[PDB]
Amino acid sequence: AEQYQGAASAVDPAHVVRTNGAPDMSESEFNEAKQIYFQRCAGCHGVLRKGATGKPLTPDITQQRGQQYLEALITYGTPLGMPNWGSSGELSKEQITLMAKYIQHTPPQPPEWGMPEMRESWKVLVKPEDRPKKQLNDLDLPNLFSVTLRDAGQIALVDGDSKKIVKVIDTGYAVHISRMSASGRYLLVIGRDARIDMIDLWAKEPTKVAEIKIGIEARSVESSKFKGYEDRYTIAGAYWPPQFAIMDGETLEPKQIVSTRGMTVDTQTYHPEPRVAAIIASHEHPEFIVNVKETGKVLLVNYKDIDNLTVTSIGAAPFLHDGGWDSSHRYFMTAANNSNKVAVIDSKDRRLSALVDVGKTPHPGRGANFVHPKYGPVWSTSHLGDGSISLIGTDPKNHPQYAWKKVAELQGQGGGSLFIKTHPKSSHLYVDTTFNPDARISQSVAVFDLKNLDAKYQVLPIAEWADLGEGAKRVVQPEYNKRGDEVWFSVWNGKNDSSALVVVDDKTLKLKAVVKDPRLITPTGKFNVYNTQHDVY
Amino acid sequence: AEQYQGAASAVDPAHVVRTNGAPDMSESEFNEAKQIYFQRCAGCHGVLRKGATGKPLTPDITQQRGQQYLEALITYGTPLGMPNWGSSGELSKEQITLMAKYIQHTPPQPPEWGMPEMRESWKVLVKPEDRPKKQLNDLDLPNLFSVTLRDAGQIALVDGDSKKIVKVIDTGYAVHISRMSASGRYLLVIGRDARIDMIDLWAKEPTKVAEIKIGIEARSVESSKFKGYEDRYTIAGAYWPPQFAIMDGETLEPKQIVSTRGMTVDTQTYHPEPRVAAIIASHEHPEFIVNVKETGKVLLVNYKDIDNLTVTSIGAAPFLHDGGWDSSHRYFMTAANNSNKVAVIDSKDRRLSALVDVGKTPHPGRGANFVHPKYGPVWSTSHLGDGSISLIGTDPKNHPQYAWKKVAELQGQGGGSLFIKTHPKSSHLYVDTTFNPDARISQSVAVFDLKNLDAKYQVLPIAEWADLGEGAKRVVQPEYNKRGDEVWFSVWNGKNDSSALVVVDDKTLKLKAVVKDPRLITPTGKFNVYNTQHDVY
Ligand code: DHE
Ligand code: DHE
Ligand code: HEC
Ligand code: HEC
Numbered sequence A, B: 001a002e003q004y005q006g007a008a009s010a011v012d013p014a015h016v017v018r019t020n021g022a023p024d025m026s027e028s029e030f031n032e033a034k035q036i037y038f039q040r041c042a043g044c045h046g047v048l049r050k051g052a053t054g055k056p057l058t059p060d061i062t063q064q065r066g067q068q069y070l071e072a073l074i075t076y077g078t079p080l081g082m083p084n085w086g087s088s089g090e091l092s093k094e095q096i097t098l099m100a101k102y103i104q105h106t107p108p109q110p111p112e113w114g115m116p117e118m119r120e121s122w123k124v125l126v127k128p129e130d131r132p133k134k135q136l137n138d139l140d141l142p143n144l145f146s147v148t149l150r151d152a153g154q155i156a157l158v159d160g161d162s163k164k165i166v167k168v169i170d171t172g173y174a175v176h177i178s179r180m181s182a183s184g185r186y187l188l189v190i191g192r193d194a195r196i197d198m199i200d201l202w203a204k205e206p207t208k209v210a211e212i213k214i215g216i217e218a219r220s221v222e223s224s225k226f227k228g229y230e231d232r233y234t235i236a237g238a239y240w241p242p243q244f245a246i247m248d249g250e251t252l253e254p255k256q257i258v259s260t261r262g263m264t265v266d267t268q269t270y271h272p273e274p275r276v277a278a279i280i281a282s283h284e285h286p287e288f289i290v291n292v293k294e295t296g297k298v299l300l301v302n303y304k305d306i307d308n309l310t311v312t313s314i315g316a317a318p319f320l321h322d323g324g325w326d327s328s329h330r331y332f333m334t335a336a337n338n339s340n341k342v343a344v345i346d347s348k349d350r351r352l353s354a355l356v357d358v359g360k361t362p363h364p365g366r367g368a369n370f371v372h373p374k375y376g377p378v379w380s381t382s383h384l385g386d387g388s389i390s391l392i393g394t395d396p397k398n399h400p401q402y403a404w405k406k407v408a409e410l411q412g413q414g415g416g417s418l419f420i421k422t423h424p425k426s427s428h429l430y431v432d433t434t435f436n437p438d439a440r441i442s443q444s445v446a447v448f449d450l451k452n453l454d455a456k457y458q459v460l461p462i463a464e465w466a467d468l469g470e471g472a473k474r475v476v477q478p479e480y481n482k483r484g485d486e487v488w489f490s491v492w493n494g495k496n497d498s499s500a501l502v503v504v505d506d507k508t509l510k511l512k513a514v515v516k517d518p519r520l521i522t523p524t525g526k527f528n529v530y531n532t533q534h535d536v537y
């Protein structure tokens, strides 16, 4: 067996390259720069630097540019998305020098996270046997609102009708979203630290029954929703490591782990860090629809047989991020934000229906579906790069002329928008502008009359209605209640500042309530149980 | 868009590790060790060194062992497969010191190989329109033998009946195998350097019509064989980079490239170098059956829609390598050699039928199928770790009691065996023993009487019948002709030595012919067109 595997490797030694020629930096210096890199740069440039949103920062490129090009670029930034760390005064000349030296070295390697680590992190707090057989409290679970108290690493269940915080549960740091099990009993939350918590809404007092950590960093979680699979499996995508994990939908036991490392859809070259973004459960087949960002692939992971996984890798467009179902729940309208496109994934026929060109940096969230008087059923989205609102036709059967076309546009307060919203019972369309550099715009939301779309929008002074005092008071993500007569908004203020949840009477557009509480720290995402569980948007 | 991707990464800086603490070595020293590493170590330890047959040689482990342990281990080796580079005198004390220092550094990175590189390497020598419409020569193409003249980087087409070299074609270095297109017109060969050459057997004189390089290092190639896909696609697996590529089966144009990097079947942890081994074309579905070694996965890559690839990842056992069809052409009998198992892949129902325990380091090649008088249809394989020959039952329908069981065993001349062989028309069973340390055994093949399996085998002095003179004269891979009355053997002698192809009258077991030629340099693999094309084994 020794002489058999004894012939030379076909790989040419000359072409295998050693890495160096980097400026010398001590342990203290290298760590200070490493800490800055993850607190300030990692989000956009990635953990490895092959590059996300912007150009790669690998040694081959950085050393080519040299110390000074790097110091200067980091110092003033660029008009294409790269913040000015020097001019703004964010970082010192000394620090920027350190970062320029740092990016000239081989990127340090973060740990991997396989089954051993997963199982070690897996915990069953309350076994399925020991869990109640019926609802042991008199809460109106369907109208409950799971609110993320970001910096607190908790979530608060707010009663829809009473406007009170019914329970505060400790979770992973800065939970990114909440999702509901198909049965409507379990609430699944995932922190950016990849920590998932499963919460039983039937317990006397809603409590965590299981937990697990599926990676170092993550964003999405979902539950199986195909007929005959209620609470069967639970999936979660991770940023690092580039992977997603399928787990038991009852105990959260890790079953399968799949690497999303691979070839890009555009250049068809290898990308060592294709982060997993949105994940939505199919209703057409027993599959999960996974978005793989950097490679721009939409994976149809079939869980009919989890031991021998079948995945259909559909090419879309680079930088897939968020998105949601069309009115019929068959077409996944997802946004390839830095490509300025919205990919239409047919979950039934399992193929890319079309690539719709939209405004700069679309950010639909899960989007807004409504029937246009002239264009029929459409799905809409606002943007981060401009104040447009794209309306895309979603009816190939009865409206072929408008299917997959940016049929019309609306104009909002400006760019920096994050979430557009509406409801089957509502006649209004809201658009927030959370990251708009103007304080007044970023603290208010635009509202359109669906019954008269030619009319300009109305501006609701959300943050002002909260009456909180100092702070940026950024408003974010409109969200209806089960009956669709009220729309909730989060007044995302600092951790040491005061925050609130503003409710609006959708019928009159008048302030209805304001939820304040010392525990309501940095409220961001809000997810009404029913509307979330049944994809009502 | 800047403040939105402006929050800190969930990844803890403290856990992202810088790599070093390695012994200082100059550029000349590092390259001398790098050159040795790929000429002598890479085959077993892998390119990135995360371990294959050989153990992990990554810095975390090597530095823990320290300079001394390393020098000593490399010097004397171990009884578990690690050759003794010092004791044998293969490497000097000076070199071993260099290697011990080298493995303590971060492994240098070999280049990737995506579509840009592939297309650049793609060449259409003769367009499909310019190619003949019928066979323009009088050769008996079905009985042609594609022989690999390993060190010459060529292959020789030998006429079966005349025993003469009809044509010598330049190819990639050390072609590993030959495969035939379903039509039986095109001959596909692939070098270990990943260079594939497509050869038209209908041209006045067989000539290359297209070529391409699918990686830095590779071993397998295959053609689509499902009804209605003759010559449609052509796949090829690569060692580095860990990937396989689907190409147009007419012009060899690159269409799809898939990364095999991923999670292992056993530990379910990430493996950065899962090399692709055997690839066999399905007859049950429009799929290719790909073996992924280190992760032990068998991929069913469906090409019905190559733009939206669907892959069924089946778990098997680590270290999948070679294997072949059962008599019926439904079950892929593959060998997970370092696991001492043979995986049975059901190509129809698309599932792992069973994991059969066999001898030490099974190496079937494509195996040998024959009907046992007592046990019914069976598939057999010899080994590299011992002299056994495992007979596994392959008839679940009419012989359930013997299906997937190591029903019986035969004993050969000893270990170091590579290929067992037989034919529907033949009543003999041959096994070679190419890497047996004994010269006499390694230069001869064992033959069994299928009509009397209790009888010991007969030893055929192949190399002696060649009458070549000096040299190790290792005999390798028995191979029948279309009619199944002759069995060919390659007398794999040195490049500066003399080699030959020995033919045997299968009916009498008597020397029939001997093919010698100054051009027949280091003949290894031989592939009869018909028997290869129609998986007759
Ligand atoms: C991939 C992804 C989804 C889709 C999940 C799904 O549907 O399966 C999503 C959804 C969301 C949703 C879902 C809302 C919905 O209605 O579906 C919310 C509330 C939200 C709050 C925020 N997200 Fe989100 N978000 C990211 C990723 C994602 N966010 C980022 O990587 C990014 C750009 C940078 C970061 O630092 O995380 C980012 C910034 C933010 C914020 O700044 C927000 C406002 C506050 C926070 O906690 O960081 N993200
Ligand atoms: C994965 C794989 C296959 C199956 C491909 C398929 O069916 O599509 C195969 C087949 C093969 C076959 C196919 C025979 C058949 O009838 O199917 C032959 C002749 C062959 C000649 C050799 N192989 Fe092979 N071989 C490797 C890999 C493989 N060999 C190695 O990695 C290894 C262990 C080490 C190496 O250096 O490549 C190795 C050593 C050898 C040899 O030493 C041989 C005898 C000479 C050589 O050229 O290197 N291998
Ligand atoms: C997104 C919110 C960013 C953050 C945070 C950081 N960078 Fe960035 N960077 C980003 C983009 C979109 C671009 C492209 C700019 C362009 O117009 O091309 C860049 C580019 C760089 C570069 C230069 C790359 C090159 O041209 O070779 C460097 C050196 C760079 N960015 C460094 C860097 C550092 C050190 C940061 C954190 C302290 C940082 N960037 C944050 C987007 C974003
Ligand atoms: C296969 C034919 C091998 C070749 C060629 C080389 N090595 Fe190897 N190595 C191999 C195996 C199977 C093992 C396991 C041995 C055991 O009994 O555990 C090893 C191990 C080593 C080690 C020790 C690692 C450890 O346990 O800490 C070292 C340092 C090592 N091998 C080095 C090495 C070098 C430098 C080689 C080429 C010059 C080399 N090996 C070739 C198998 C094979």
Ligand SMILES: [O-]
Residues within 6 Å of the ligand: none
């Ligand atoms: O987001």
